[PDB]
């Protein structure tokens, strides 16, 4: 399955919120590239044949195992929306 799906159901009230947040996370991971990660130093996804899971074999698992750490914060209205919604799509 996926790492700690029960844990993932732990910190979110509704599973649909979980789906939204993880997929949106994958969306920035695509748009800025996988440089904007918060698990860089030691614990990265580890591919079998090589270290291919360093860059981008699957963004959804990247976002999920990003969420298991405490470095991800989500909310209904956490940031003034307009600034980052116009700065996200333009780079």
């Amino acid at each position: 399955a996926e790492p700690g799906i029960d844990k993932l159901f732990g910190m979110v009230d509704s599973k649909y919120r979980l789906t939204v947040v993880v997929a949106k996370r994958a969306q920035q991971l695509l748009r800025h590239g996988f440089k904007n990660t918060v698990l860089e130093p030691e614990e990265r996804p580890k591919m079998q044949t090589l270290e291919g899971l360093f860059d981008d074999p699957n963004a959804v698992t990247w976002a999920m195992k990003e969420l298991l750490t405490g470095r991800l914060v989500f909310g209904e209205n956490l940031v003034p929306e307009d600034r980052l919604q116009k700065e996200m799509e333009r780079l």
Binding site: A1, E2, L18, T19, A23, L30, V60
Partner: peptide, 16 residues
């Protein structure tokens, strides 16, 4: 779409 992939893998995956 990666969003739909997230949907399927989270709530339509048969292991869940």
């Amino acid at each position: 779409s990666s969003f739909a992939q997230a949907e399927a893998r989270i709530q339509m995956l048969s292991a869940h």
